[PDB]
Amino acid sequence: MDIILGIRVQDSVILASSKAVTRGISVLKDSDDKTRQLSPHTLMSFAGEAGDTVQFAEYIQANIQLYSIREDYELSPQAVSSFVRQELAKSIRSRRPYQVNVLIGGYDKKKNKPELYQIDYLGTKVELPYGAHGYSGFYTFSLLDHHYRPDMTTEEGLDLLKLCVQELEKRMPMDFKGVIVKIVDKDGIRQVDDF
Amino acid sequence: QFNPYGDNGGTILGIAGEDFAVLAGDTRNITDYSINSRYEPKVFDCGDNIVMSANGFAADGDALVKRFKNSVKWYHFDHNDKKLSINSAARNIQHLLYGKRFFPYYVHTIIAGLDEDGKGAVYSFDPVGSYEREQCRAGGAAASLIMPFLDNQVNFKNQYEPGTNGKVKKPLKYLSVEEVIKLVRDSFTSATERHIQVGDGLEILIVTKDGVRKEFYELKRD
Amino acid sequence: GSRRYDSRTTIFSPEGRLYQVEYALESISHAGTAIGIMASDGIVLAAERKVTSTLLEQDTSTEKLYKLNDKIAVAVAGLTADAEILINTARIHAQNYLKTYNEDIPVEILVRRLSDIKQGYTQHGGLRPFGVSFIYAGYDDRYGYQLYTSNPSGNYTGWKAISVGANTSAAQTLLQMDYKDDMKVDDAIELALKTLSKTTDSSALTYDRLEFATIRKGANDGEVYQKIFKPQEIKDILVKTGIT
Amino acid sequence: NNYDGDTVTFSPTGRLFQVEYALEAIKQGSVTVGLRSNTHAVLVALKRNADELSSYQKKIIKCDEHMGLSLAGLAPDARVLSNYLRQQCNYSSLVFNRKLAVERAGHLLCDKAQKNTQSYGGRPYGVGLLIIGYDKSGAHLLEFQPSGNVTELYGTAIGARSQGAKTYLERTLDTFIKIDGNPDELIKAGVEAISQSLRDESLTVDNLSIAIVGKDTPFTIYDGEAVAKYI
Amino acid sequence: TTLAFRFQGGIIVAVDSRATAGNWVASQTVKKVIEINPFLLGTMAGGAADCQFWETWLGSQCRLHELREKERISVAAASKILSNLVYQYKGAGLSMGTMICGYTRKEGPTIYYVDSDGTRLKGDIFCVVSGQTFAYGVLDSNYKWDLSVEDALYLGKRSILAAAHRDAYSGGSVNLYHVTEDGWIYHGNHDVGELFWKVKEEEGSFNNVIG
Amino acid sequence: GYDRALSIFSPDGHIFQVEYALEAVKRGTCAVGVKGKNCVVLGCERRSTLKLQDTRITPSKVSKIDSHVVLSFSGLNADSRILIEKARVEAQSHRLTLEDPVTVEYLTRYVAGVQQRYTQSGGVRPFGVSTLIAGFDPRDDEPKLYQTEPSGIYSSWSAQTIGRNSKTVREFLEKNYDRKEPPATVEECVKLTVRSLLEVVQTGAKNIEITVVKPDSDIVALSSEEINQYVTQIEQEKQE
Amino acid sequence: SDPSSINGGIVVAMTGKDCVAIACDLRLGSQSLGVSNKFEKIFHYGHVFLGITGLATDVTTLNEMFRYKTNLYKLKEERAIEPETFTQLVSSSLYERRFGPYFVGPVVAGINSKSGKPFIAGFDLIGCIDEAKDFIVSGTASDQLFGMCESLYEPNLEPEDLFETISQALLNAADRDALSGWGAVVYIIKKDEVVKRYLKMRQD
Amino acid sequence: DRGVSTFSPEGRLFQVEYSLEAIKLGSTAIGIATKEGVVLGVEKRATSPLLESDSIEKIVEIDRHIGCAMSGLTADARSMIEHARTAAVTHNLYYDEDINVESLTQSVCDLALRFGELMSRPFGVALLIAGHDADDGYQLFHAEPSGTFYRYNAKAIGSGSEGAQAELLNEWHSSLTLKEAELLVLKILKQVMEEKLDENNAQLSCITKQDGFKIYDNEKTAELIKELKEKEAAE
Amino acid sequence: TQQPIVTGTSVISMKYDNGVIIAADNLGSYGSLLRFNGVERLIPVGDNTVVGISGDISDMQHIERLLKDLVTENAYDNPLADAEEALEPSYIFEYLATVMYQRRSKMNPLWNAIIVAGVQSNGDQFLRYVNLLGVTYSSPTLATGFGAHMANPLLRKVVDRESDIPKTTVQVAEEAIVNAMRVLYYRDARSSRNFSLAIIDKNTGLTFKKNLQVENMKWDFAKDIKGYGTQKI
């Protein structure tokens, strides 16, 4: 199964996502990026049913990009998260619901605060210091419930995330072929190569 | 519940010669263990030197053949009486079949005729419209009995030149219409013996530059 | 058939004007004057009720000043009924935005939508345009205090101070003369009333012929209050500014 | 005058001017002749070119193996009506395994034309058709007017100078009706009929268009060096 | 078995030709590569009709793009046309496993895997071994980036032979295609029956066989 | 639904509603486009009949369609918003399906297509708008400037103007713009655009807007003071 | 599988002398896994309080929906909606999804601003109204809350007394439910003051 | 006012006859059919020297075997070209071959009379549709907004048509080479054009069986213009 | 998609030298209950066609109305309605076949098996079958339900092939049909003694026989059968 983790530190949001795409007993890719840049300071990671995941993320990306061009303004993460939740909340009672679970990591330039949102395919939304989707949820959560500190720095956050991935590799039965890590801060969205 | 599909049995065989093609089928129509008709044609002249058979569910086969016959009529109307080439007919039939992709035609479709170079051609389709051009094809209930024979006797498969000990394959050669008809008769005679749904009669349509001619041979009625 | 009786409400004149839009603007020029003034610390909306009676219940009456949400109000000039159709549409858009994004709608986005509806009635459908001009007074946390106007054409523009309805030419000259950028709300209240008092076709400006509203950060700390003035409160501000 | 703005308006004398204007488009069209015996039915059509570089506009359209028409007026309107006949002929074959009777083909064209004369927004058809066919009651010739009026005839002609051909056929009635089991002689009578409508121009190899249907003859069109025999 | 991998010399595409209905071998000459345009190739795995019909349709949509924009369609754009179409029919029972391979100046050599599930992936190597799609070759040991074209062709041919022997539903003949700048080149059809014996003798592999 | 045919032919083969739409454009404030060697500049007139205007919030005349393409217009302001909205939606729709931003030529062809459709559709009048569409194609350094009009025809221009007194500023550009050597720098190109507007504008104060678009989504709008420095230098060279 | 017990949680409301109280837990889970301990289930539209238990996507959706509807009400009516009227609006809104319902257990609490009369109500997922004098319960530990309320409750309790009763009713009910707890909030509501208290409780 | 589909007392549709007037105001387009191919030429007619002429697209590809030149309200042609391209490709999808030039023309002409109170008015543009097919070889068609189409050995449309057509009447024979036809289109365009014909204000194109439909380079057309000037000066 | 409620059993038919014969019993069964007697299941269309129908009776009565409506419609603007443009057996069949296949393809079938018997204009014998699936076929002998299993074997001993049709008289053909109806009464638990028989001859036209009874039955041998094996009394 797919690993997507989010940790919100003092001044940034870090998203770790598994790089493997598997359908049954076949591994289709070992370099997959399960992330879409919604806006310059907002990043969305997604896990779920094949096709639905990318289609939903690209659909959300297009709508947020349209808003940005039309108003020459960046929607706040709180606003972007609410839009995404509502699209999912529509889809559950639709003919064929989108089976996608997302993490939204954004930096709010107005409040100068990083924000992390966890949304499931039903349109269930919460704001959290740290979040995750799937089987990797029960482990990471308890681990982070012990190590996470509200005033942690980005470097401290990466080390804790590094620990979570290492422990997940040992404890998880499926091979998720490593993770891709992306940081969201005031300066924007960057990818951490060394991990 | 109501089941919209049925099986009317029968077997169709298409062989392509150098300057001719044959499409043959048994004239027997069955349901379950009863015989519906000992003579009910399944190989039709569709015009423009094209012969077509849709074998499986008889209702779906009759409907498809009608739609293609209609399709040929409207080709002439919309394209200044252009002759419909076998490759164009094949592509048209794919679109007919794929139209009912989510409520398929339960039939095996073979069409025979001459290609634009005047060489013999056979086209074979699956129920949902997948098609391919072939030298040989058998369709229907007794397809599994006949196709191996045709592989051996038409394409000379697993046959080598005596004294080479499998070093050199038997040379491929174009069969005459007379040789091809013998293989068709032998294939149906054999299939009739071992398949309960095959028998009563055999109708062969031969396609040449001169046109479409029809040969009929009796089969065992048990 | 039916072609015989069609006015064709969405065609250009040989001069490239829209007949029905131009005629609708003529209608609005006869409506009671509405003024909006934007200050550093708030916005004022002042408007004149059209020739009233002594038997009109004023305290339960509303024809000029309407609330769109807690942050945005409009002053109306034209057909009141036509305005109420558009006001209810705007109130719904504001609540649609809040439901989708969980943020109060920015003033311009609401203005642009109402303006785009008006535009549609001029380009398709073969129906008459809305005989309405709006002054939008609003606050958001992007551009702060904002004044806009829209007219039947669906065109909209931003303003420091503006007038719609009757005697706008005269009103706009008086505002352009006395308005300064460093101006405060108390000053803007005085300017608005002094402008109506000079432009009015009535003999004198009294409480029973006015609707008045302020949008102030004069709300305890970091928030915005809308005040639709009561008859007695309009009477008091008329004495304070020294008009009665 | 005041009553020709649309097809939904009667004049004070009970005339439909839009229909009468449509009828005018036919008279401007090039001449076409129709005649039949007991065994065969023939169409002869004079095709019209734009200039010497241009082709000669096709006049005859096949509707089925046993039926087809010649057109005079708006060619696109002939295309719409012929397509409708093709469909109705086709429906009869598929559903009832029945070749559509020529008389019933007439009844269907009539009813399609009528609807365009009683409803606002629409317009009448601007073309006249000569339908020939062989069915279970033998050879047939029909004349269609976009008013909706369809008439069964031994012979007729429509288009510019059609009156010349129509008079000739009215004299030859007793002769050409008896031309049974001789297609060439029936076409000769048709070519001699259309000749009575020519002025200045004569019948050339790329000018003349002939069609025939009969007892053991499918509806076939002859153009080019195939009609040189009859010139 | 369909194979498409990327190397210095371009793209190698190798497929088998067997079609089955249950245990019945319906055809051994099926063409599992569709030539969309001179620079674009599509492989077919899953439902024969689904792949044939929609990849032929894709060729039409690619042709219209060329006309409307006076330019070759990008592999990314062509792949997404097919991926967006199948996504509309998602859950209706379409069975499709397909790789869109082409070269364009804008992107260079590109392979996109397009699924009936609506999955669209870009990668250097994709393999479909009956019912299973992999990001690795059947062998994958011999795979190095810097390979001779004629050397790379053999790896693709050898890889199809490996699957053809072991997999019951793979067999018939091997069809080879080489995709480069200025179009693709057909490298012929090789009957597995003849190929197997030759390869065995020359390579000294399949020792578990006996012959 | 209202089906009435408002754009029809006249006995002389003219569509008056489309021609009257061009009259709406003639009334609009002047807009000019000039492309240099490595840039395109969009100059726009602001009629000074409206003061006490809030320039912070008032709709600007140049609109970004994407990060690399801009649209200016002359004619009905309300009508222009509908074309801008449709263009912005199509720009994101193209990115979503082709996985590449629109070429300037493609975005132009789309907007021109919409304008045409509103000339032979029942119950609708044509757009009282002409557009200048400028920008750089993805990964291209060749400047692009296109024009559209209510009829739906479009074409590419070395330099072009639309709106009131466009005949005058086109006259200026036709004698002052050399094809063999276009404005080499941004300075030269902005100068020639400001010069072209000064032929028509009145005062060089808050009446001229300038937007510079450079390759690779580099778009900036000049301020009052920056434009005022060009206005000062042009007239000081003219005093000779 | 059962939508009304995926996320878990509880709400309880009580009446007192010239006051009402409404309280909820703070847990949101994916069945056994606890995700959030900040998921409040009590919302207020003016002086009318609404608690919602059940599927969390529907709790959020109905909050956004009733905020929408009460905002439009206030703009048109020129007054805040009252508890009795809001109760009828909740019922109406739920029954219009009769054959595709929101999987929720709503609870209304508030004092009528004119009559000063304390008011509470509960609803089933399709919008049937339970208008009890004493107390209303909702959620995965409804059986436990019914037990606690039925024994602890007496009529005409003073505000500071009613607080203790409703707090002990929630806390002890939540501790006997796997899908409830992780904190609790209690609203004491008088005619013109409302106090909100977070309770210390076990986090297992 | 009056119906859009109204007949005149002479039995002609007002709106169709009026659209034919719009086409007369259009820039000239010429087509010549030979046994070696079909040539298509147009006058570009730029409204200003600042207008980049190469952006004026009045010769358009429909398929590899069918070209198209336009004259009149050229914006109206975009949806007709779109339909033609869709018809040509759709037919190739359904029948695995190239569509007949007559069938493609017939498809475009079926849109013509789809107007009433469907689109609000007829098309204000005429098309020259040139192509090759195996059945009827090299063909040139004239598609009008009436829905009528004629085949032509040679045809001119637009402002200089009746002058050009009279010239084509004398010059065309059945033995014309492709090189002869190119020069002949350039000759007649240069005759009816207001401005002096060069490689920037005129555009050539042809359709051959071998190479299909090609729009000529400005450099290629320039050489044929220089070849024309010399052969006219030769007597 | 439904289930048949009130049902009719076998329809049987064959060709002879000069025409065709068709027969069917007068019963409408409600499952195991033999509820309706006197139900006519042979429905004549003009004087050249008889349509025999088995299966759901409600669907039969619907088809009866379609055929009644087909005769009315054919007469409309048709001066040769009683001559050259009269309804042919082949026309009536192709219509029913079209309806049957359309109804199955909307997953809402007419729950019937139909045999169209008649003589064409040129005197050619017509006999073709269609059912709820839209499946069609022709044979010198045709039968539905139990008839297919028991009647066909007996009728095929008179006409085994096409060449046997000229050698088969109307007396021989009718004898074979009447015997087959007796066999079906012996052996079909959903048959009745009372039946209708229709002859369509190219010379003598349409003869419709009602209130026919199975006669010359063999039961006497029953008295001699005691027990299931070992019982002697």
UniProtKB/Swiss-Prot annotation, chain A:
Xref: Pfam families: Proteasome
Modified residues (N-acetylmethionine): 1
Subunit composition and interactions: The 26S proteasome consists of a 20S proteasome core and two 19S regulatory subunits. The 20S proteasome core is composed of 28 subunits that are arranged in four stacked rings, resulting in a barrel-shaped structure. The two end rings are each formed by seven alpha subunits, and the two central rings are each formed by seven beta subunits. The catalytic chamber with the active sites is on the inside of the barrel.
PANTHER family registered for this protein in UniProt: METALLOPROTEASE TLDD, PROTEASOME SUBUNIT BETA TYPE-1
Note, other: Present with 21800 molecules/cell in log phase SD medium.
Record family assignment: Belongs to the peptidase T1B family.
Protein name in UniProt: Proteasome subunit beta type-4
Gene: PRE1
Swiss-Prot record, chain B:
UniProt GO BP: proteasomal ubiquitin-independent protein catabolic process; proteasome-mediated ubiquitin-dependent protein catabolic process
A Pfam family it matches: Proteasome
GO cellular component: cytosol; nucleus; proteasome complex; proteasome core complex, beta-subunit complex
PROSITE patterns xref list: PROTEASOME_BETA_1 (PS00854), PROTEASOME_BETA_2 (PS51476)
Source taxon at top rank: Eukaryota
Keyword Cytoplasm: yes
InterPro entries in the record: Ntn_hydrolases_N, Proteasome_bsu_CS, Proteasome_sua/b, Proteasome_suB-type
Key words, A-Z: Cytoplasm, Nucleus, Proteasome
Function description: Non-catalytic component of the proteasome which degrades poly-ubiquitinated proteins in the cytoplasm and in the nucleus. It is essential for the regulated turnover of proteins and for the removal of misfolded proteins. The proteasome is a multicatalytic proteinase complex that is characterized by its ability to cleave peptides with Arg, Phe, Tyr, Leu, and Glu adjacent to the leaving group at neutral or slightly basic pH. It has an ATP-dependent proteolytic activity.
Family from the record: Belongs to the peptidase T1B family.
Protein name, as recorded: Proteasome subunit beta type-6
Species of the source: Saccharomyces cerevisiae (strain ATCC 204508 / S288c)
Name of the coding gene: PRE7
Swiss-Prot record, chain C:
CDD domains: proteasome_alpha_type_4
A biological-process GO annotation: proteasomal ubiquitin-independent protein catabolic process
GO cellular component: a single term: proteasome core complex, alpha-subunit complex
InterPro entries for this protein: Ntn_hydrolases_N, Proteasome_alpha, Proteasome_alpha-type, Proteasome_asu_N, Proteasome_bsu_CS, Proteasome_sua/b
Cross-link (Glycyl lysine isopeptide (Lys-Gly) (interchain with G-Cter in ubiquitin)): 99, 198, 230
The UniProt record lists the keyword Nucleus: yes
Domain of life, per lineage: Eukaryota
Coiled-coil segments: none
Subcellular location: Cytoplasm; Nucleus
Pfam families, alphabetized: Proteasome, Proteasome_A_N
Quaternary organization: The 26S proteasome consists of a 20S proteasome core and two 19S regulatory subunits. The 20S proteasome core is composed of 28 subunits that are arranged in four stacked rings, resulting in a barrel-shaped structure. The two end rings are each formed by seven alpha subunits, and the two central rings are each formed by seven beta subunits. The catalytic chamber with the active sites is on the inside of the barrel.
Miscellaneous information on this protein: Present with 17100 molecules/cell in log phase SD medium.
Name of the protein in question: Proteasome subunit alpha type-3
Taxonomic source organism: Saccharomyces cerevisiae (strain ATCC 204508 / S288c)
Native organism taxonomy: Eukaryota, Fungi, Dikarya, Ascomycota, Saccharomycotina
Swiss-Prot record, chain H:
Pfam hit, one: Proteasome
Family recorded in the similarity comment: Belongs to the peptidase T1A family.
Subunit structure: The 26S proteasome consists of a 20S proteasome core and two 19S regulatory subunits. The 20S proteasome core is composed of 28 subunits that are arranged in four stacked rings, resulting in a barrel-shaped structure. The two end rings are each formed by seven alpha subunits, and the two central rings are each formed by seven beta subunits. The catalytic chamber with the active sites is on the inside of the barrel.
Keywords linked to the UniProt accession: Cytoplasm, Nucleus, Phosphoprotein, Proteasome
Gene Ontology cellular component annotations, sorted alphabetically: nucleus; proteasome complex; proteasome core complex, alpha-subunit complex; proteasome storage granule
Modified residues (Phosphoserine): 48
Species the sequence originates in: Saccharomyces cerevisiae (strain ATCC 204508 / S288c)
Annotated compartments: Cytoplasm; Nucleus
Name recorded for this polypeptide: Proteasome subunit alpha type-5
Coiled-coil regions, chain positions: none
Phosphothreonine modifications at: 47
Function of the protein: The proteasome degrades poly-ubiquitinated proteins in the cytoplasm and in the nucleus. It is essential for the regulated turnover of proteins and for the removal of misfolded proteins. The proteasome is a multicatalytic proteinase complex that is characterized by its ability to cleave peptides with Arg, Phe, Tyr, Leu, and Glu adjacent to the leaving group at neutral or slightly basic pH. It has an ATP-dependent proteolytic activity.
High-level lineage: Eukaryota, Fungi, Dikarya, Ascomycota, Saccharomycotina
